[PDB]
Amino acid sequence: TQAAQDGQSLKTRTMLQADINKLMEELDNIANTTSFNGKQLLSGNFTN
Amino acid sequence: TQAAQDGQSLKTRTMLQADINKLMEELDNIANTTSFNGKQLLSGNFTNQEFQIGASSNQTVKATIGATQSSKIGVTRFETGAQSFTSGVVGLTIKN
């Protein structure tokens, strides 16, 4: 939303995108990291 | 208006025109200078810009500041007919 305005040049939008990249990296890290004793919980292999 | 009087020779009128050139040099200097962070505002490249102001995805206002250089603002239209040698009752009609 902050970058959806037109008071921001391509450089500042690029800063936004670079930050979003790291945030999404963190999201993937949480997903692939949370585990009980090896059993990865939030990855998709905890079914049935 | 100061130059439309006939109490001024061509020399003094030239000082008038010499001045307008500088003033008009200033006008389009303002047009090419006002900017936020490089975005020229009063130049003609601020057309169809959005400003997301809503919770959902496409609520936005739009801004289309026209161009205001010294070559695009004052555009009058002159007309003049041939030397009329004939008489007669005339009625014009400026269409549209």
Curated annotation (Swiss-Prot), chain B:
Reported induction: Translation is inhibited by translational regulator CsrA (at protein level).
Knockout consequences: In a double flaA-flaB deletion, cells grow faster and are non-motile, flagellar filaments are non-existent.
Location in the cell: Secreted; Bacterial flagellum
Swiss-Prot/TrEMBL domain comment: Interacts with FliS via its C-terminal domain (residues 537-576), interacts with FliW via its N-terminal domain (residues 1-44). May form a 3-way complex of flagellin, FliS and FliW simultaneously, in which FliS and FliW do not directly interact.
Function: Flagellin is the subunit protein which polymerizes to form the filaments of bacterial flagella.
Family: Belongs to the bacterial flagellin family.
Record's protein name: Flagellin A
Species: Campylobacter jejuni subsp. jejuni serotype O:6 (strain 81116 / NCTC 11828)
Included stretch of the parent chain: 97 to 192 of 576
